[PDB]
Amino acid sequence: TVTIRTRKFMTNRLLQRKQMVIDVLHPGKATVPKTEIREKLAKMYKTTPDVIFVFGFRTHFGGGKTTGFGMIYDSLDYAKKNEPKHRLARHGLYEKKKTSRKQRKERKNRMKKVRGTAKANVGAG
Amino acid sequence: HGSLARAGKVRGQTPKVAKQEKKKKKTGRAKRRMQYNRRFVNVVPTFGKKKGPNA
């Protein structure tokens, strides 16, 4: 049904990564999701799906092509190393657990006021 | 000098008339279409001594 083709293709052997521009054509239904595009690209590259990422998607005003940037690696350790934590957050490899405003800054001020043992008492709890 | 009691005399003593149920008007491109087809398709039997956009 869908047709996935890479237009531009580069290889950076310094990180063992392969960058590509991916166009997924749709003469039919809606935008095929992240997981399904990832699985089809993993089947077309004939490796494990947990090493290939993709980011960004467009739509050319009525069916048409959807354009993104795909990253094929060769190691899950290299994926943990050379990728940001928010692009690991699509699969949940990193969790921050404090996505809150003013908590860090109020702990900064409560450490800025007192010093030493009282600072370790107040700022760490 | 003059009296200040006569304010809005004509607006008060004018008898009110209810606005009738006018049908809706085609607007925009449709309005320019009817403006073209009102004064550019069937005007040529008339003569220049008289003009009738309102009477």
């Binding site: - | 003059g2 200040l4 304010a7």
Partner: protein, 141 residues
């Protein structure tokens, strides 16, 4: 008649910079007395407070009793004879209300029917006088 040499441009700019003041528009635009003499401080609009309601007379060929409002300003603190625009609005302007005022058609001259009124009421107590003349936006009190 003129001065038409190659080194006469200082004489030209001197004569032109002198004779440019005799135009009325240039001197009323670039002389400070037309800012420190007029009201509004050289602005577009001004708020004010109703002091009294005056029935002024019209000119010689037109016999009418125009309705004006004497307005104490807030910005400068002057007194301005404003003007009630429409057929009514004398009953819509009460005593000591916030009144926005503007010009008629020109800063200097006035309208040829009212003798000494340069200014016009636009709002009455933060609700527009067009709404007070129409049906919508009835007055608070």
């Amino acid at each position: 008649g003129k001065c038409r040499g190659l080194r006469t441009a200082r004489k030209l700019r001197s004569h032109r910079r002198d004779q440019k003041w005799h135009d009325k528009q240039y001197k009323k635009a670039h002389l400070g007395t037309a800012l420190k003499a007029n009201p509004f401080g050289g602005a577009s609009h001004a708020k004010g407070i109703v002091l009294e309601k005056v029935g002024v007379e019209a000119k010689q060929p037109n016999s009418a009793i125009r309705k004006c409002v004497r307005v104490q300003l807030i910005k400068n603190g002057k007194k301005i004879t404003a003007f009630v625009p429409n057929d009514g609005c004398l009953n819509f302007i009460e005593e000591n209300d916030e009144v926005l005022v503007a010009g008629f058609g020109r800063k200097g001259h006035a309208v040829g029917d009212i003798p000494g009124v340069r200014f016009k009421v636009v709002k009455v107590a933060n609700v527009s006088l067009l709404a007070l003349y129409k049906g919508k936006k009835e007055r608070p009190r």
